[PDB]
Each structure stands twice: as C-alpha cells, then as structure tokens.
Amino acid sequence: TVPSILNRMQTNQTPPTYNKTNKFTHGFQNIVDAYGIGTYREINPAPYT
Amino acid sequence: ALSDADVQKQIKHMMAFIEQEANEKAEEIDAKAEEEFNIEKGRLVQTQRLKIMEYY
C-alpha cells in the first residue's frame, strides 16, 4: 500500500550521450561513433554525414 | 511531489516502517519473555509443589 519514490539530485558525474536512433540512421550514427561519441549535447555530425 | 519536504514525508513513512518492525520485534521477544517467566517460574514452583505433596 505504501508507495515508492523516484528522486532527482544534484549530480557531478558527466551525462552520457543518447540519440534516439532510427532504422535508417543507425549505420550513420555508428559511423560517427566509430571515432568517439560526442560530448553531452554537442552537434551530432550524423545527420549531416 | 518530490520536494525536500516530500522526501521528508516519505522518510517519515519509512520511519513508521522501521518503528513497526522494531516494535514488533521488541514486543514479540518481550511477550515471549513473559511466557518464559510464566513457564520457568511454574517449573520451579512445580518442583516446590512436588516437595510439598511428598511432605503432606
């Protein structure tokens, strides 16, 4: 009966990078990932590549 | 809500949880202690009773 809780917090660790890839763009996203994944929220070269 | 006051509210729920666990443990062992006093005092008194019946 008594519920659980989900908590936010001030964080010092660096966020990962995520892209919501789709069927068509997966190969290109991998192509740009091959040389290092972009830092949090920097411009992705995948849509232009 | 997820404010610090809400965190304290959930912490109060968990405090009630630990209070339930601890009170149950303490009163369980204490009531078992009362029953053990009953039966052990009864066994010593039963030794005395058997002595009294032998005598009488």
UniProtKB/Swiss-Prot annotation, chain A:
Subunit of the V0 complex of vacuolar(H+)-ATPase (V-ATPase), a multisubunit enzyme composed of a peripheral complex (V1) that hydrolyzes ATP and a membrane integral complex (V0) that translocates protons. V-ATPase is responsible for the acidification of various organelles, such as lysosomes, endosomes, the trans-Golgi network, and secretory granules, including synaptic vesicles. In certain cell types, can be exported to the plasma membrane, where it is involved in the acidification of the extracellular environment. Required for assembly and activity of the vacuolar ATPase. Belongs to the V-ATPase 116 kDa subunit family. It comes from Rattus norvegicus (Rat). V-ATPase is a heteromultimeric enzyme made up of two complexes: the ATP-hydrolytic V1 complex and the proton translocation V0 complex. The V1 complex consists of three catalytic AB heterodimers that form a heterohexamer, three peripheral stalks each consisting of EG heterodimers, one central rotor including subunits D and F, and the regulatory subunits C and H. The proton translocation complex V0 consists of the proton transport subunit a, a ring of proteolipid subunits c9c'', rotary subunit d, subunits e and f, and the accessory subunits ATP6AP1/Ac45 and ATP6AP2/PRR. Interacts with SPAAR. The modification Phosphotyrosine is found at residue 18. The modification Phosphothreonine is found at residue 14. This is V-type proton ATPase 116 kDa subunit a 1. It is found in: Cytoplasmic vesicle, Clathrin-coated vesicle membrane; Cytoplasmic vesicle, Secretory vesicle, Synaptic vesicle membrane; Melanosome.
Swiss-Prot record, chain B:
Its main location: membrane. GO terms for biological process: proton transmembrane transport; synaptic vesicle lumen acidification. Coiled coil: none annotated. The modification N-acetylalanine is found at residue 1. It comes from the Eukaryota. One of its GO terms (cellular component) is cytosol. Keywords: Acetylation, Cell membrane, Cytoplasmic vesicle, Hydrogen ion transport, Ion transport, Membrane, Phosphoprotein, Synapse, Transport. The modification Phosphotyrosine is found at residue 55. Expressed in brain (at protein level). It is found in: Apical cell membrane; Cytoplasmic vesicle, Secretory vesicle, Synaptic vesicle membrane; Cytoplasmic vesicle, Clathrin-coated vesicle membrane. GO terms for molecular function: ATPase binding; proton-transporting ATPase activity, rotational mechanism. Subunit of the V1 complex of vacuolar(H+)-ATPase (V-ATPase), a multisubunit enzyme composed of a peripheral complex (V1) that hydrolyzes ATP and a membrane integral complex (V0) that translocates protons. V-ATPase is responsible for acidifying and maintaining the pH of intracellular compartments and in some cell types, is targeted to the plasma membrane, where it is responsible for acidifying the extracellular environment. V-ATPase is a heteromultimeric enzyme made up of two complexes: the ATP-hydrolytic V1 complex and the proton translocation V0 complex. The V1 complex consists of three catalytic AB heterodimers that form a heterohexamer, three peripheral stalks each consisting of EG heterodimers, one central rotor including subunits D and F, and the regulatory subunits C and H. The proton translocation complex V0 consists of the proton transport subunit a, a ring of proteolipid subunits c9c'', rotary subunit d, subunits e and f, and the accessory subunits ATP6AP1/Ac45 and ATP6AP2/PRR. Belongs to the V-ATPase E subunit family. This is V-type proton ATPase subunit E 1. It comes from Rattus norvegicus. The chain holds residues 2 to 57 of 226 of the full protein.
